[PDB]
């Protein structure tokens, strides 16, 4: 079982609606555990998971300080970016930051990242070697220069290869019952006669974790041409997903649904009957 920790940062200028918005969320695997909302009341980092709640005031004070520093940096960046692209301070703009790390099944460092975006487009990102940068355009070239001269890379690499990984592991034990769990999908099939010539077969997967899963439709034991809905959150820490096929009436038994998830000892095969 592989694992990961991610932080997603959103910075939004809003001319005529007050000061810039800043939001940070933290994930371990497919579970979120922390948040910060500059519009919220506490002005602190907040627990968004029961298992993180048992962290002491030392932890929360520290995280609050950092996220505030993060916020300030993005506040400055918003204006800087306006300058690089020659934009008036009337338009609304968004900055996005994402960093975190990956561990293999052995819980050892696999890979780390630091991706940065401006108005939904790539801006600058840390290469896999965690030693060099990729600038999306000429503007990001100037940032690339800055960051090289300031040795930002080695700073991040230290975090990504170490602290990030060590804390991912710590979280994994602290949230054993939650994070180190697999919830096998509950399945069932529903037949719905849409037209007189065609009916829809929908294959359901519910209450599964983690989110990874694959649903396939086969006719006579052969893969199919099919509506596959984006995996959605149930709101209780599990995920849902369904796959549907439009089949001619009477030929229902020709079709079989195939569900695979790491919570299952082996794949499931569902037929309408």
């Amino acid at each position: 079982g592989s694992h990961s920790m991610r932080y997603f940062f959103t910075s939004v200028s809003r001319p005529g609606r007050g000061e810039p918005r800043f939001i940070a969320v933290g994930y371990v695997d497919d579970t979120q555990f922390v948040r910060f909302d500059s519009d919220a009341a506490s002005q602190r980092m907040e627990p968004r998971a029961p298992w993180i709640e048992q962290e002491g005031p030392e932890y929360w004070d520290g995280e609050t300080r950092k996220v505030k520093a993060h916020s300030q940096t993005h506040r400055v960046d918003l204006g800087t970016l306006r300058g690089y692209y020659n934009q008036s301070e009337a338009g609304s703009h968004t900055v996005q930051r994402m960093y975190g790390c990956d561990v293999g099944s052995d819980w050892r460092f696999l890979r780390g990242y630091h991706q940065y975006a401006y108005d939904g487009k790539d801006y600058i990102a840390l290469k896999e070697d965690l030693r060099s940068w990729t600038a999306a355009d000429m503007a990001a070239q100037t940032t690339k220069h800055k960051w090289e001269a300031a040795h930002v890379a080695e700073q991040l690499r230290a975090y990504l290869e170490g602290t990030c990984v060590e804390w991912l592991r710590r979280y994994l034990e602290n949230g054993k019952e939650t994070l180190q769990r697999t919830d096998a999908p509950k399945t069932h099939m529903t037949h719905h006669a849409v037209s007189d010539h065609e009916a829809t077969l929908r294959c359901w997967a519910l209450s599964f974790y983690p989110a990874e899963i694959t649903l396939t439709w086969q006719r006579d034991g052969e893969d199919q041409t099919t509506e596959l809905v984006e995996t959605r959150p149930a709101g209780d820490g599990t995920f849902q997903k369904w796959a549907a096929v439009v089949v001619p009436s009477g030929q229902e038994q020709r079709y079989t649904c195939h569900v695979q998830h790491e919570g299952l000892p082996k794949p499931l095969t569902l037929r309408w009957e």
Binding site: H70, Y84, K146, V152
Partner: peptide
């Protein structure tokens, strides 16, 4: 935990 160091501006 978030990164500890101060983040360079763009």
């Amino acid at each position: 935990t978030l990164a500890c160091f101060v983040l360079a501006a763009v």
